[PDB]
Every structure is written in C-alpha cells, then in structure tokens.
Write a protein that binds this ligand. Structure first.
Ligand code: R7T
Length: 284
C-alpha cells in the first residue's frame, strides 16, 4: 500500500512536522470580510478561525445572514459537508435555522460540551424527552425523541419543527464522546466504526442536504472526519486506488475552509485512519 509506504518513510525519518508545515505554506488564502464586520464579533468563537466569503453558508434572513460555517464541495467524490464551529449561547438559534434551511439529515459532533475544564460549545440540544427547547429568535422547536448510548459514541433522534409552517423533520445527532482532551486516539478503529455508522444512516447521501459537522473551532477533528470519508470514497471509485493522494485532497478541502487539520499528529492520525479503513475494505 503506497500511502502506507509514504507513511513508514515519514515515520522512520520523523518528518511529520515538516510535511505539515509544507501544507500550511501551500494552502489557499481567500478573503473573510463578512466574518470580520463589527456586527459579527459575538458570532465568532475564535478570532483566527473564519469562513471564506466565497464558500460561507448564508442564513435566509434580511437582518444579518452571517454564521461561522463553510460549504466543502468535493466534485470528484460527489460529497458535500458543512463544517461549523460549536454553537455559542447567542448562535444556537442560527445553528438550527441553518440545519432547517440547508435540508440536512444529520449533525456530527466530535467534542464534549466541557473539555480541559472549559466550555467548548453550548448545550444546544435537549437532554430529556419532556423538556423541549424553543429558539424564539428563529421560530424553531427541538424535541429529544430517543437516545442510544454506546461505549465510544451516542446516537440521538431529534424532531425539528418550523413553528412558522408546522412542518417537522427527523434529525439524527451522531456524538463521538471519547476523543481525548490532549493529542489523538491511539487506534483509529473506534473513529472508523463511528464514520461507518454515520454513512449507514443515510446522513451523507445525495438525497439529503449536506451533513453538518462540528468540534470546537470546526477545523481540526472536523477536518479529520471529512478528509478520511472523502479519501476512502475516492479509493472505491477510481480504477487505480494507489493514486489517492491524501495531501492533495486536504489542499482541495482547504480551498473551502481555512486551517483544516490543526496539528502534525492530526495529519498522521488521518493517514492511519485511511490506511486501516482500506485494509478492512480489502477484506471485511
Ligand atoms: O495503494 C495500494 O497499493 C492499494 C490501495 C487500495 C487498494 C484496494 C482498495 C480499493 C478501495 C478501498 S481499498 C489496493 C491497493
């Protein structure tokens, strides 16, 4: 396996930091002027993570259409993803407006609400069936329907109601709960299992709007999820699987959102996940 050879060569030479910096150097730079307007300061979690103007998701309202979210459109793989920050106390209603307007079936959450003793995102979904949430600013109601708690992830069924029209939709919430506070998982087995569970739900399929994916900033863990998915889909589709270049797929994705894959360890983990996800598709 070529990617596996490139992998053993970088590991034996200990050059992960050098490969990573080369990607940082070659990555696209596009304007983010809407993100930086003074009216939007409390809509951004991090001053250094903004959506590009060309790929940003627009809210369908005349007041202020801004949300920190990007459309990643992968033309050859035929997959689209929305990558977004963890919602803030004043953007939870905007978040559910986006899910509604973009016709998403699934939300993928890769963080815990508290990590390293600090809040990484708002408690944006209801924890009990009989205590629903109403978002008065966007006119939406959200109800917990069911919850399935497993060792490495939790799946929830949610009902989202547009209070304006009384239409309802079922949203699936896929919550990966065991990413460690520091570094990356030792084995990619539980992350690949989780990826397969999202695929099996229909959430990534072209009959729905794009999947919404987030962590805290929406670039690191979130970047790893869409990079692994896209690379495995391309290996399934092409006559020569050996031709899939993970570094070139990552640079393509960085044309749509800055900073995807935050560390040399996240880059190495993405290689491991793709290599193992291929080894098992080589014989399940
Ligand atoms: O790089 C290789 O040598 C290689 C990679 C993948 C395959 C077979 C696969 C096709 C699709 C997913 S795995 C064969 C050879």
């Amino acid at each position: 396996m070529e990617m596996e050879k490139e992998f053993e060569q970088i590991d034996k030479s200990g050059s992960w930091a050098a490969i990573y910096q080369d990607i940082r150097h070659e990555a696209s730079d596009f304007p983010s002027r809407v993100a930086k307007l003074p009216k939007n300061k409390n809509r951004n979690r991090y001053r250094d993570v903004s959506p590009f103007d060309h790929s940003r998701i627009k809210l369908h309202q005349e007041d202020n259409d801004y949300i920190n979210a990007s459309l990643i459109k992968m033309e050859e793989a035929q997959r689209s993803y929305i990558l977004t920050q963890g919602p803030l106390p004043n953007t939870v209603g905007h978040f559910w407006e986006m899910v509604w307007e973009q016709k998403s079936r699934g939300v993928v959450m890769l963080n815990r609400v508290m990590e390293k003793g600090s809040l990484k995102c708002a408690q944006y979904w209801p924890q009990k069936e009989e205590k629903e949430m109403i978002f008065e600013d966007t006119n939406l109601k959200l109800t917990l329907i069911s919850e399935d708690i497993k060792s490495y992830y939790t799946v929830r069924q949610l009902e989202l109601e547009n209070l304006t029209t009384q239409e309802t939709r079922e949203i699936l919430h896929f919550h990966y709960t065991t990413w460690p506070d520091f570094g990356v998982p030792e084995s990619p087995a539980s992350f690949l299992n989780f990826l397969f569970k999202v695929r099996e739900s229909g959430s990534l399929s072209p009959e729905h709007g794009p999947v919404v994916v987030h962590c805290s900033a929406g670039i690191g863990r979130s970047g790893t999820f869409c990079l692994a998915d896209t690379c495995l889909l391309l290996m399934d589709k092409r006559k020569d699987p050996s031709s899939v270049d993970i570094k070139k797929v990552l640079l393509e994705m960085r044309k749509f959102r800055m900073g995807l894959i935050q560390t040399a360890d996240q880059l190495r983990f993405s290689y491991l996940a793709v290599i193992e996800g291929a080894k098992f598709i080589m014989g399940d």
